[PDB]
Design a protein around this ligand. Structure first.
Ligand SMILES: Nc1ccc2c(N)nccc2c1
Ligand SMILES: [Ca+2]
Ligand SMILES: [Cl-]
Ligand SMILES: [Cl-]
Ligand SMILES: [Cl-]
Lengths: 250, 56
C-alpha cells in the first residue's frame, strides 16, 4: 500500500496473509470461517501446492502476539476463464483445512448479494484497500498491515482519465492518477471493502495496474459482484482431492 | 418501493415482488427487525462489523 496508514490492530479483521514456505505471497479476504477470497494470479507460479498457509489476525509481521491463526489451504478454486499471466477473471476461492475461530481480531467480511452489490455498493464512492505490500514503487514491503481509502471510477471515466490491458466488465478502477496513493505488488488478493449502513462488504480484489502509484494510472480491482453466484455454489460443494481446482465460470 | 432506488429502504438485501411488494433481508448472523428494513446481529461476530469499534 502506497500513501496510506497503518490499519490499527483489529480494525482490518478480515485481512488474510497468504504464505508459501513462510514467505509472503499475497493477501486475501475472509468471508466465513473456512473460506478466503484472493486473486487467481497469486498462484500462477506455485510449485508445492501443499505448503500454502493463510494467517488470520495478523498485524505486525515482526512479532507474535497470540491473536494470529494459521491454517493450511486445502483447496484453491479458480474460474475456468482465468488464463495465467493475464489479468481477467482474477479471483480465487480458498478452502482452509480447518475453520478459523472468530474473535475480536478475526472476523469475516460480508460477501454481498449480487443485486445489492450492483445497485447500491457500486455507487458508494470510497472503499478501503489493504495489505502488507510495497509502501513505495520499487520499495520495501510493510511490516504493519496498511490501509488506504480509494475512490471508484466508472470504467468509461477510468479509460478517459488514464494517460495497457482492457478494463473488462470483470474489473473496476479505483484510486488516484497523481501518483500519491495506490495498492501495489504484495497487496494482490487483498480486500477492497465497502461500507454501507454500518456494515462492510467485499466489492473488489487487489488485482493489477501499471507499476505502483504510477502517474496517470489507477489501480485495477476484480469486480466481485460478477462472481457471487459462482462463489456461493462452490461454497456449497464437497471438497475434491488435489489443491488446485479449476471450476466452470459462469 | 423498488430495490434499485435507495436500496428499497433496506439496510442490507432487497427483493422486488410482483406488485408494489418489496422484501428486505439480512445476511446470515443477522435478523430483520419489525420495521421490515433493519438488520440486527444475532451472533457475537457477525460479518462486516469491527468488534473493537462496536465496543468503542
Ligand atoms: N501486482 C499489482 C497489483 C495491484 C496493483 C495496483 N492496484 N496498482 C498498481 C500496481 C499494482 C500491481
Ligand atoms: Ca503478529
Ligand atoms: Cl458437489
Ligand atoms: Cl496436490
Ligand atoms: Cl449476540
Amino acid at each position: 500500500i502506497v500513501g496510506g496508514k497503518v490499519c490499527p490492530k483489529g480494525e482490518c479483521p478480515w485481512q488474510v496473509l497468504l504464505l508459501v514456505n513462510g514467505a509472503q505471497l499475497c493477501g486475501g479476504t475472509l468471508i466465513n470461517t473456512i473460506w478466503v477470497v484472493s486473486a487467481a494470479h497469486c498462484f500462477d507460479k506455485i510449485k508445492n501446492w501443499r505448503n500454502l498457509i493463510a494467517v488470520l489476525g495478523e498485524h505486525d509481521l515482526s512479532e507474535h502476539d497470540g491473536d494470529e491463526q494459521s491454517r493450511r489451504v486445502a483447496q484453491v478454486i479458480i474460474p475456468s476463464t482465468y488464463v495465467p499471466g493475464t489479468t481477467n477473471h482474477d479471483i480465487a476461492l480458498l478452502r482452509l483445512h480447518q475453520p478459523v475461530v472468530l474473535t475480536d481480531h478475526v472476523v469475516p467480511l460480508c460477501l454481498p448479494e449480487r443485486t445489492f452489490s450492483e445497485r447500491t455498493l457500486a455507487f458508494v464512492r470510497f472503499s478501503l484497500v489493504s495489505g502488507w505490500g510495497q509502501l513505495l514503487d520499487r520499495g520495501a514491503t510493510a511490516l504493519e498491515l496498511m490501509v488506504l481509502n480509494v475512490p471508484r471510477l466508472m470504467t468509461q471515466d477510468c479509460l478517459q482519465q488514464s494517460r495497457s490491458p482492457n478494463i473488462t466488465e470483470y474489473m473496476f478502477c479505483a484510486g488516484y492518477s497523481d501518483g500519491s496513493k495506490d495498492s501495489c505488488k504484495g497487496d494482490s488478493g487483498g480486500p477492497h471493502a465497502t461500507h454501507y449502513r454500518g456494515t462492510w462488504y467485499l466489492t473488489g480484489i487487489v488485482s493489477w495496474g501499471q507499476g505502483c502509484a504510477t502517474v496517470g494510472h489507477f489501480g485495477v480491482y476484480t469486480r466481485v459482484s460478477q462472481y457471487i453466484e459462482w462463489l456461493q455454489k462452490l461454497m456449497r460443494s464437497e471438497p475434491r482431492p488435489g489443491v488446485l481446482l479449476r471450476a466452470p465460470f459462469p | 418501493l423498488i430495490c434499485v432506488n435507495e436500496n428499497g429502504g433496506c439496510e442490507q438485501y432487497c427483493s422486488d415482488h410482483t406488485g408494489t411488494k418489496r422484501s428486505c433481508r439480512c445476511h446470515e448472523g443477522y435478523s430483520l427487525l419489525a420495521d421490515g428494513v433493519s438488520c440486527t446481529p444475532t451472533v457475537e461476530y457477525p460479518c462486516g462489523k469491527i468488534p473493537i469499534l462496536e465496543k468503542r
